């Protein structure tokens, strides 16, 4: 019920943006009274925030634990790129699209700003271990985020979350991330990443 | 000096910062310091400004794209030249107009002309990449790498990289290098010089 509201909001937000989407629409979408929607969320902003943090917080949490494991920076970067793409392909709607909406810059979303900055730092720091003080160090994060422009957005999960395999696109973008750094692909990257995903 | 270009600049600012729905023509007119009556002379609606904005921004990219795609060099040189020149374009403007592509509103039928221009641009990238990598999902990557500059540049009215005949912007070179690297394709000889001349050639 709570998750149904979030799903419908995700669709409306990613399709219409923030400003035009109304609570009336969200409530109508899930087929409940607006009073009933209010029980669940006080404002569309709180909904928008709830979506936004459920989307990146799992990445940042996972990011520091994998950035701090016993491999090399090539492997750690490959794992974080692959895990992040894995996440972005695991949702019914393309919630990553929400980052691009002008509203997210506002002070209300300071919690997201911090989490996004933290993730960006992880990508950049790992990358600089490989290429040093080099502008290419910015690239792995953007390469990772480009999946948001590649995946569908129609209510069907492009790649259901799996512990047994990585999505082709996840592997591709992770391979691309090292190629751009001129770093060779580490041995047994996928299996290790899957193990590095589990902890 | 240039009333129509000032209107577009201010609109570019307001739209990228506020989105489409909340931006008003009153704000745009106030921004450039003219009466709304005077603004109405140049543009009838917010939707039309948004189109003129998108169309002054995407057509030169598509024209540039299809002109570089048809020249007797190798697919690597053409792809490199088009990536660097397209990033150069996106870095040459007072405002980050590339951010506009990301607004959900542009998907609507009213912006069908932008859709085709974008499709044509995307096809030019894809065809070049497939000449290099064949039936391979990596062929999708150079276009997205190119567009990633939209997430890199400033957006405050100051041009990140003023247009130049002597040089290419660092970020333009980097993204073009990156576009070939992901394809496993070698960097062409004299990439910058070769590209700058092709840009000069393109009038």
Number of domains of chain A: 1
Query: How widely separated are the two ends of chain A?
Result: 30 Å
> Tell me, what's the shape of chain A?
elongated
Most extensive chain interface and residues per partner: A-B, 30 and 29 residues
Count of helical segments of chain A? 9
> Helix fraction of chain A?
55-70%
| Sheet with the most strands, sense and barrel status of chain A | none
Calculate Rg of chain A over CA atoms: 18 Å
Total beta-strand segments of chain A: 0
User: Quaternary arrangement of the chains shown?
Assistant: homodimer
Features:
homodimer, 199 residues, 0% strand, transcription, transcription regulator, nitrogen regulation, dimeric
Overall description:
Chain A is mainly alpha-helical. The first copy, chain A, has one domain (1-199). The first copy, chain A, is 61% helix and 0% strand. Chain A has nine helices and no strands. Chain A has helices spanning 2-16, 23-30, 34-40, 44-67, 73-88, 110-131, 139-145, 168-179, 189-198. At the A-B interface, α1, α7 and α8 of A face α1, α7 and α8 of B. Chain B: It holds the Pfam family TetR_N. Chain B: This is AmtR protein. Chain B: Keywords: DNA-binding, Transcription, Transcription regulation. Chain B: GO terms for molecular function: DNA-binding transcription factor activity; transcription cis-regulatory region binding. Chain B: It comes from Corynebacterium glutamicum (Brevibacterium saccharolyticum).
Write the topology of this structure.
Two copies of one chain form a homodimer.
Chain A (H helix, E strand, L loop, with lengths): L1 H15 L6 H8 L3 H7 L3 H24 L5 H16 L21 H22 L7 H7 L22 H12 L9 H10 L1
Helix pairs in contact in A: 1-2, 1-4, 4-5, 4-6, 5-6, 5-7, 5-8, 5-9, 7-8
PDB class: transcription
Keywords: transcription regulator, nitrogen regulation, transcription
Assembly: dimeric
């Amino acid at each position: 019920p709570r998750e149904e509201i979030l799903d419908a909001s995700a669709e409306l937000f990613t399709r219409q943006g923030f400003a035009t989407t109304s609570t009336h629409q969200i409530a109508d979408a899930v087929g409940i009274r607006q009073a009933s929607l209010y029980y669940h969320f006080p404002s569309k902003t709180e909904i928008f925030l709830t979506l936004l943090k459920s989307t990146v917080e799992p990445s940042t949490v996972l990011a520091e634990d994998l950035s701090t494991l016993d491999a090399g920076p090539e492997m750690r970067l490959w794992a974080i790129v692959a895990s992040e793409v894995r996440l972005l392909l695991s949702t019914k709607w393309n919630v990553g699209r929400l980052y691009q909406l002008p509203i997210v810059g506002s002070e209300e979303f300071a919690e997201y700003h911090s989490q996004r900055e933290a993730l960006t730092n992880v990508f950049r720091d790992l990358a600089t271990e490989i290429v040093g003080d080099d502008p290419r160090a910015e690239l792995p994060f953007h390469i990772t985020m480009s999946v948001i422009e590649m995946r569908r957005n129609d209510g069907k999960i492009p790649s259901p979350l799996s512990a047994d395999s990585l999505p082709e696109t996840a592997i591709m973008l992770a391979d691309a991330s090292l190629a751009v750094l001129g770093a060779p692909l580490p041995a047994d990257r996928v299996e290790k990443t899957l193990e590095l995903i589990k902890q």
